[PDB]
C-alpha cells in the first residue's frame, strides 16, 4: 500500500508542479497522472486555462495547514529529477481537485505508477459532464 508523508511548501510554481521541503532537501515534484494547461510550456508558454491551474493549485497548498506527498509503486523522480507524486492539502488531493474543476487531463498513464488512474478517471468524466473550463 502507499503511504502519505510530510512535506513543506516552498514554493508553487505551475498547475502542475510544486518545489516542497521533503526529507530535509528541497525537490521540484510533477503531479502524478494528470496534465494541466501550461503557463511556461517549453514550446507554447502561456495556454488557455493555464493561469487558472496555476493559480488553483498555488491557492490549495499555500492556504494548506499540512501537506503530503505520496509516491506511486513505480519510479518517484522523472528524468529530469522531479518527484512523482499524489500531492494532498489538508487531506485533499491537488491532483484530484484539478481533474474535477476541469483545470486538467488526465495524462498518458503508465504501470506501475497508475493506482490513483480509476478515481481520477471519474472525476475527469464528471467535469466533462458538467462542461466546465477546459471541457467548455
Do not use: C
Not at 516552498?10 to 502524478?32: C, E, H, N, S, W
Not at 493559480?55 to 518517484?76: H, L, P, S
Amino acid at each position: 500500500k502507499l503511504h502519505k508523508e510530510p512535506a513543506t511548501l516552498i514554493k508553487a510554481i505551475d498547475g502542475d508542479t510544486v518545489k516542497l521541503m521533503y526529507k530535509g532537501q528541497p525537490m521540484t515534484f510533477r503531479l502524478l497522472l494528470v496534465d494541466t494547461p501550461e503557463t511556461k510550456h517549453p514550446k507554447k508558454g502561456v495556454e488557455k486555462y493555464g493561469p487558472e491551474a496555476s493559480a488553483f493549485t498555488k491557492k490549495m497548498v499555500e492556504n494548506a495547514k499540512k501537506i503530503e506527498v505520496e509516491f506511486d509503486k513505480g519510479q518517484r523522480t522523472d528524468k529530469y529529477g522531479r518527484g512523482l507524486a499524489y500531492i494532498y492539502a489538508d487531506g485533499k488531493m491537488v491532483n484530484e481537485a484539478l481533474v474535477r474543476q476541469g483545470l486538467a487531463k488526465v495524462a498518458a498513464v503508465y504501470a506501475p505508477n497508475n493506482t490513483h488512474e480509476q478515481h481520477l478517471r471519474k472525476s475527469e468524466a464528471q467535469a466533462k459532464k458538467e462542461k466546465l473550463n477546459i471541457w467548455s
